[PDB]
Write a protein that binds this ligand. Structure first.
Ligand SMILES: COc1ccc(Nc2ccc3c(CC(=O)O)coc3c2)cc1
Length: 188
């Protein structure tokens, strides 16, 4: 077959009932995740290959970066609660990996302030139980699939994208192959 289990994708040994249709996991410490955001725009290109209105979910993970890695999962919960993901994704990636100006929770908060989120607004979200639940939700989704590597994408709780089986001599071909695979999996 053109698409084969073990090539462009793998099949979860224990499917995840009730999982989101397209689920991405990333870390702001993750070098390929930086590329998936700034150079490849994987999420945008996958969205354009799926039908209008399908839900795509993107969660942060704890297992990279120690203390700050957990602070970033909580900050990503704030970003989701406030709806400001598009305002903070690039500054957080660059603060961690390019300028290395993010060394503490205060530095993370600075990124949101500079992006125009009010201080009182950020701190109330940071300390809220709604954000505690969003942190728990991100942890539970990663736990459900025994996640040990990012960037990862899962389709309908059953299939995991295998980008190591995609050719990377041409970045646009790679993005297209990745998005076409998601579309194929979503239609199974
Ligand atoms: C800069 O553009 C790019 C970006 C990425 C790649 N290849 C690549 C290879 C392996 C993985 C894994 C699995 C893992 O190691 O956990 C996740 O994502 C990957 C991406 C090639 C070119």
């Amino acid at each position: 077959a053109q698409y084969e289990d073990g090539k462009q994708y793998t099949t979860l040994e224990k499917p995840v009932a009730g999982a989101p249709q397209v689920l991405e996991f990333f870390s702001f410490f993750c070098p390929h995740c930086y590329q998936f955001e700034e150079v490849l725009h994987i999420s945008d290109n996958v969205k354009k290959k799926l039908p209008e209105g399908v839900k795509m979910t993107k969660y942060h993970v704890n297992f990279m970066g120690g203390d700050l890695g957990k602070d970033l999962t909580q900050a990503w919960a704030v970003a989701m609660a406030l709806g400001v993901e598009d305002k903070v994704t690039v500054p957080l990636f660059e603060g961690v990996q390019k300028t290395q100006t993010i060394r503490s929770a205060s530095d993370i908060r600075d990124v949101f302030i500079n992006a125009g989120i009010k201080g009182e607004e950020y701190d109330a979200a940071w300390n809220s139980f709604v954000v505690k639940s969003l942190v728990a939700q991100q942890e539970k989704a990663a736990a459900d699939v025994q996640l040990r590597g990012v960037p990862a994408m899962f389709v309908n709780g059953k299939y995991q994208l295998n980008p190591q089986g995609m050719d990377t001599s041409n970045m646009d071909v790679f993005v297209q192959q990745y998005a076409d695979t998601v579309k194929y999996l979503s239609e199974k």
